[PDB]
Amino acid sequence: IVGGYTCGANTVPYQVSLNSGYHFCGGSLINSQWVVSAAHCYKSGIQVRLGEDNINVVEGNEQFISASKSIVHPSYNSNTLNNDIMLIKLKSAASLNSRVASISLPTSCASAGTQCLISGWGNTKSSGTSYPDVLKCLKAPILSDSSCKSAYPGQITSNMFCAGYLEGGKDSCQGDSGGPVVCSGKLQGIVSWGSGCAQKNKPGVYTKVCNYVSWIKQTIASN
Numbered sequence: 001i002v003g004g005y006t007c008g009a010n011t012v013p014y015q016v017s018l019n020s021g022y023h024f025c026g027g028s029l030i031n032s033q034w035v036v037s038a039a040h041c042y043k044s045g046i047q048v049r050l051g052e053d054n055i056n057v058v059e060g061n062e063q064f065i066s067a068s069k070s071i072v073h074p075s076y077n078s079n080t081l082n083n084d085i086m087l088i089k090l091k092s093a094a095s096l097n098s099r100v101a102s103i104s105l106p107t108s109c110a111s112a113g114t115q116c117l118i119s120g121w122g123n124t125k126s127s128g129t130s131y132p133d134v135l136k137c138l139k140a141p142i143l144s145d146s147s148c149k150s151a152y153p154g155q156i157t158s159n160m161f162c163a164g165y166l167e168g169g170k171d172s173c174q175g176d177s178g179g180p181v182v183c184s185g186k187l188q189g190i191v192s193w194g195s196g197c198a199q200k201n202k203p204g205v206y207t208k209v210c211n212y213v214s215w216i217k218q219t220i221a222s223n
């Protein structure tokens, strides 16, 4: 997160860190046994780390659980990043409390102008790499479809939306990949891609979760 602030320990209880010996992507807890992240974060040997704040210090509240299976969307296109969503089933269920809690899936899509909270342990520099130890947060609005397509002509599908600041300075970045975009307490987006981080007129593009609710529910129901 570039231009964001320190969230404060456990103030984003649904945030998870996907770990393979280091933090490589974020994700969101949607029930005690399933996490939603981005398809491009897929790899084998993933350990899901819940209740984290400082990812390099065990401070208490952490629950480290191995992923039993990862289900990348069948129509995921790695070249366009269309359908960039993945579900991860945990080997055992997590214990939910106040520090670890799941976030709700939306019933409707959000409108432009909705203010959302994006969080993660991704890069904090737009020019260079600086990865933080604790969780960063950023409040950002969903942009209109016209502004989004004007910024990324020919690359936005109906399963994507832009959120951010066209002036640059505040944005999500690499490492935040796979994590949550929550608006009015519902998970509306997944950090997917963008041109650089916090660059002028190049907002972040997020997977539009409201288009995948039936898929998520049917898939969980059958696994």
Ligand SMILES: NC(=[NH2+])c1cc2cc(-c3cccc(-c4ccccc4)c3O)[nH]c2cc1Cl
Binding pocket: 024, 025, 040, 041, 042, 171, 172, 173, 174, 175, 177, 191, 192, 193, 194, 195, 196, 197, 198, 202, 203, 204, 205, 206
């Ligand atoms: N808001 C933005 N401007 C933005 C920037 C990046 C940058 C990345 C990214 C860059 C390099 C590698 C990965 C990556 C690839 C495989 C696994 C994990 C991360 C990224 O997600 N993802 C991003 C998503 C967003 Cl919205």
Ligand SMILES: [Ca+2]
Binding pocket: 052, 053, 054, 055, 056, 057, 058, 059, 060, 062
């Ligand atoms: Ca920790």
